[PDB]
Write a protein that binds this ligand. Structure first.
Ligand code: ADP
Ligand code: BGC
Ligand code: MG
Length: 465
């Protein structure tokens, strides 16, 4: 039919707006670095907040003792505990428990959120076993990972700037996040002190360097996206105090808020942001992150189902529901290799509520997944490239000389579990770097590395007891 040429025009504008030629990706990485300079000088209306984390020393390995850690969590939260042995023994024992965050606790009362996470910590310590030991009359200490933007005022205190990725809890914005948790921990009859609070990009970087000395940055790709690196304290113009002893400082970029006119956006991105929980915010993240990838696919499939009767001569009701197509669903369809795409189609049945799909519709669906995941994974690589160019690792030494070994720790379910996304991320990064430079960059997987990373930073910041 013509219905066919109508569908072709839609897919063409998608592959036209989503187009990310390497040349454009270079300009975006350039813009990323200009925005990093902007945030470190505290330019007003800076997208990149570039927040001082007060982490001036990443873990050395001489960490010793018993420390707990709390990690929250865009979709989950975990309570961790480890007995750190020292330079030689290291981590002796380690236990953990992950709990899924109930959907209401993301949009309710902050007392409800922190009461829930503190009551799960309560029963977790109460099960403290035998290979963990706290010296007599000492107080247990907590490393707290907070995956949302926070304005830091010390290693263990900070103001919530805004909420992201699904959360919308009134009353916390502007309040100390550790004081809020501490209270809830008291309301639970629990004796614990939080000695280090850190983003989750900062936490992974800490836990990342504990097992690999060359880790220079950490990138998160889960329900949200963000990145942290180590910077030179002289390269931050808004620093006011007296420089750290190590001359280094970990910066939480909060790069999900990056916006640029070089970003390849479309009407599907405009509508998504318009109907979002935080409209206008987190523009970059809403093209990369797991919370938004499937939703972009659903909105493209919706244009096609309507302007092209792709799934029938009546748009399916389920397709009009926002966030009905989740990114792991998108992921499953994308990796279908069967000749007739029976597993993509079996997924479409559940999500659309249609009864069958044509083989052409399946192929169009598979192409939409490809275009959306590609744009996200390429732009994410362009961001990592920008970090490497901030640290001056986008190039090899001309001495000619030795080669640096630069490791970037990666964490999050999108990167860990979306295969194509992962290989497209790494291919583009190697493409963005030279063949020469790419042989010096390592993308390590440090799943949930903020859990222990926060406990390690709690160790170096003990009381001691
Ligand atoms: N199989 C998958 N394919 C694609 N994305 C996935 C998959 N599994 C999980 N994800 C993404 O990872 C996110 C979970 O990652 P995670 O790091 O564990 O938590 P957080 O929600 O804190 O970011 C999910 O929101 C989802 O968007
Ligand atoms: O989850 C990784 C990142 O996702 C972003 O949406 C949040 O603003 C960050 O606080 C977080 O570190
Ligand atoms: Mg996980």
């Amino acid at each position: 039919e013509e219905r066919r040429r109508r569908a072709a025009a839609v897919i063409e504008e998608v592959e036209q707006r989503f187009s990310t030629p390497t040349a454009l990706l270079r300009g975006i990485a350039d813009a990323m670095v200009e925005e990093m300079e902007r945030g470190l000088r505290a330019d007003p209306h800076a997208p990149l907040k570039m927040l001082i984390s007060y982490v001036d020393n990443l873990p050395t390995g001489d960490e010793h003792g018993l420390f707990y850690a709390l990690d929250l969590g865009g979709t989950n939260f975990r309570v961790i505990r480890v007995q750190l042995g020292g330079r030689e023994k290291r981590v002796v024992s380690q236990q953990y428990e992950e709990v899924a965050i109930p959907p209401h606790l993301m949009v309710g009362t902050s007392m409800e959120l922190f009461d829930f996470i503190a009551a799960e910590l309560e029963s977790f310590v109460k099960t403290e076993g035998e290979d963990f030991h706290l010296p007599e009359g000492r107080q247990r200490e907590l490393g707290f990972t907070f995956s949302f933007p926070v304005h830091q005022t010390s290693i263990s205190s900070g103001t919530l700037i805004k909420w992201t990725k699904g959360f919308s809890i009134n009353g916390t914005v502007g309040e100390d996040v550790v004081a809020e948790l501490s209270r809830a921990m008291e309301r639970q009859g629990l004796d614990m002190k939080v000695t280090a609070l850190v983003n989750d990009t900062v936490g992974t970087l800490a836990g990342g360097r504990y097992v690999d000395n060359d880790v220079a940055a950490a990138v998160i790709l889960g329900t949200g996206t963000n990145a942290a690196y180590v910077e030179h304290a002289n390269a931050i113009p808004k620093w006011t105090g007296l420089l750290p002893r190590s001359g280094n400082m970990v910066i939480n970029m909060e790069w999900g808020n990056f916006k640029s006119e070089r970003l390849p956006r479309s009407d599907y991105d405009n509508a998504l942001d318009f109907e979002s929980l935080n409209p206008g915010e987190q523009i970059y993240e809403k093209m990369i992150s797991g919370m938004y990838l499937g939703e972009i696919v659903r909105r493209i499939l919706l244009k096609l189902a309507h302007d092209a009767s792709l799934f029938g001569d009546v748009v399916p009701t389920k397709l009009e529901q926002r966030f009905i197509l989740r990114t792991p669903d998108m992921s499953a369809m994308h990796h279908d290799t069967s000749h007739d795409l029976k597993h993509l189609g079996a997924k479409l049945k559940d999500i659309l509520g249609v009864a069958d799909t044509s083989l052409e519709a399946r192929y169009i669906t598979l192409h939409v997944c490809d275009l959306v995941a590609e744009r996200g994974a390429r732009l994410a690589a362009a961001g990592i490239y920008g970090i490497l160019k901030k640290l001056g690792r986008d190039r090899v030494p001309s001495d000619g000389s030795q080669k640096q070994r630069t490791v970037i720790a990666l964490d999050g379910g999108l990167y860990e579990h979306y295969k194509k996304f992962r290989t497209c991320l790494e291919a583009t990064l190697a493409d963005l770097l030279g063949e020469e430079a790419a042989s010096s960059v390592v993308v390590k997987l440090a799943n949930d590395g903020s859990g222990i990373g926060a406990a390690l930073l709690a160790a170096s910041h003990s009381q001691y007891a």
